[PDB]
Design a protein around this ligand. Sequence first.
Ligand code: XMY
Ligand code: FPP
Ligand code: ZN
Lengths: 323, 407
Amino acid sequence: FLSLDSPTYVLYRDRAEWADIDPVPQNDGPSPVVQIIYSEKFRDVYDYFRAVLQRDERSERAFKLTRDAIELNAANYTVWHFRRVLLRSLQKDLQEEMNYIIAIIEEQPKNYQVWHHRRVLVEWLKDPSQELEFIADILNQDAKNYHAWQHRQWVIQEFRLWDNELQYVDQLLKEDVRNNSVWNQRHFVISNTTGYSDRAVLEREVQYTLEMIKLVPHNESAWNYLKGILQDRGLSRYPNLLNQLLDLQPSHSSPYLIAFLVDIYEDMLENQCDNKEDILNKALELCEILAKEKDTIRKEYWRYIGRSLQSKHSRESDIPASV
Amino acid sequence: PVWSEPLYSLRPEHARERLQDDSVETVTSIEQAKVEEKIQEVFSSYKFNHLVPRLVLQREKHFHYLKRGLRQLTDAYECLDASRPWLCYWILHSLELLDEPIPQIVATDVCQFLELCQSPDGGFGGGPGQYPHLAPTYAAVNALCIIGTEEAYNVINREKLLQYLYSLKQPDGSFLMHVGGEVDVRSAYCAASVASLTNIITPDLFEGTAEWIARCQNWEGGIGGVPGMEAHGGYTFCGLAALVILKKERSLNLKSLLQWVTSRQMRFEGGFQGRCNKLVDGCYSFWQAGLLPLLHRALHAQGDPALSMSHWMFHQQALQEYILMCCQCPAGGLLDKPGKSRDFYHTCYCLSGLSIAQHFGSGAMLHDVVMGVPENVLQPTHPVYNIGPDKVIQATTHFLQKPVPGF
Ligand SMILES: CCCC[C@H]1CN(c2cccc(OC(F)(F)F)c2)C(=O)CN1Cc1cncn1Cc1ccc(Br)cc1
Ligand SMILES: CC(C)=CCC/C(C)=C/CC/C(C)=C/COP(=O)(O)OP(=O)(O)O
Ligand SMILES: [Zn+2]
């Protein structure tokens, strides 16, 4: 063995144990387009990789070569497919292969193939016992790594590992209440365990989220979560929610509270509420406050909403033309 | 008036759009503030130097950068050695947007190269000798339609390409990216794009695909990579563009999606984030803002009467301001945000978004908005395939005069 970054690393063309193999150059054609001017190390590894792949040489030395190829371009799915062929043909120890992949993910965690490979190992071994702790380490260095959170959702759902995840969620919201991946993970855990149709869980979740909004009123994730868990039943199906938000208006205001009020109004109008025209006017006023002053970046949106609301909820909207 | 500032990012009111951290510092807010601090230096730079702002797209500089990369790349692109049709598509599409002709000698060399990337069993690989993969397959078919010559179209093995697609199709309606690979909403978009351009869609190819994509829309209104994952701009563009191809956009809750994407525009910086409470990035000028013409077309297809007939439903001005002032590298090429280095990926999608923001069209109603000097105007791009609209028409009309494989 010889690591790709070792100071005593030697090119493959200089290795006596590789002298029987002719390297295969890349078939780039007579006048290449988008030709990459590879480093010596890179072109050397892939010239010998092309050779073992062309032979379909299922040898120990080939298995070691794919390690070097993967480190030079860990997005080369072809090299990863061959490594999985060799893993099964050579009957390689898959826990030794897990020690390898925990290391490679540590050094390049923002990559599709490393995480997929880890998932294949876990399915082969049928062993999730290291996953939640390893993922927790990757997340301790990037609490928003998309592949990490995707992998964590797979392990939890496929091995029914729900027991302690809401507690893990709570720990990371403590650390960064703006971590939108954690709010999403919080919705994943509840959606699959108790669901939000349990009235106690939903209440607990709304109380919790409001407490968070009260603390960081400009944090957009708490607002999006609150809308997400209530919008499915219909924001107007919760009569108390409107007055409670208006009670935050003076000392916890944001464009996110203004916009939520327009969202409540929109649904109240869609459900034939009392004081229809009064509600329509309150909504139209907030749309223009948001479009002109509070949330101007979204002026085309709030203006469109104001036109939608007028289009179908004005007193004239149901009235015939001849009238 | 004369005290009036035409640049949105430079008005006095604009200071009010800076981050409010509520005196609760977390990593998200610190990282957000650091960007706003760096962007503000960009916006204030004219005032502090006592110059009048000019917003100029450095066409000649980007052309030189693109023209050379189409031929040769430094070893910095070793990380993309399995994505070389992507480099073809990004560079060819940037040149197209910049209204730069593709020499017939370059066109044919590209044809010969993607031919070498094509697998005997359908699909294209990231380079010659590599196994096929839906992502370099989508890029190769796009690059081949951008060239759009008779030679380019004939590179595609349509019979085998359909065989490849079927071999990745999953029972729940999803696709694999490649044999032994992962499943996420990118494969659905990749498969439908190539299959519709080349006319190889069969009555059962995408059975249950629209239904699988719709399960990827989460509580945010955007779309995650697989069901249950956080909404993201790249996956959301993939998910909604795929359904438009399949004529199934109504499977989604389009209202909660419209609300989601418009909130991904940054009130201060003017560009888009990829997901809530992350950082602005010039490439989401396409992945996020491209979602608005798709939404416009869908709601107009349902007779929504409130749709604007002159603007997309985002701040077109602000986005052109961010791309022109913040994402241009003075040596050519565009980039993520100030302080990052250039690359052909951001070059492709910064210019793709710039073009989206410049050009509104819904039927006969056309209305352009070109910030800065008028030469900044780019060629239009098609918001489903992100190749020039003319190229989509030309390709589909060509391939519709073939039979669907197996009849
Ligand atoms: C010069 C390298 C550019 C890196 C960029 C593109 N990139 C890619 C590589 C091959 C094909 C392709 O397809 C395409 F173009 F996205 F359609 C994308 C990646 O993998 C990493 N990225 C990092 C990035 C930059 N800004 C947001 N991100 C996160 C991100 C994650 C996944 C995807 Br996927 C796209 C973006
Ligand atoms: C083939 C095709 C059409 C692809 C388009 C899809 C696309 C752009 C996907 C992004 C997927 C992803 C993991 C993003 C997170 O990267 P990150 O966390 O490093 O960046 P972020 O912080 O901006 O989210
Ligand atoms: Zn980017």
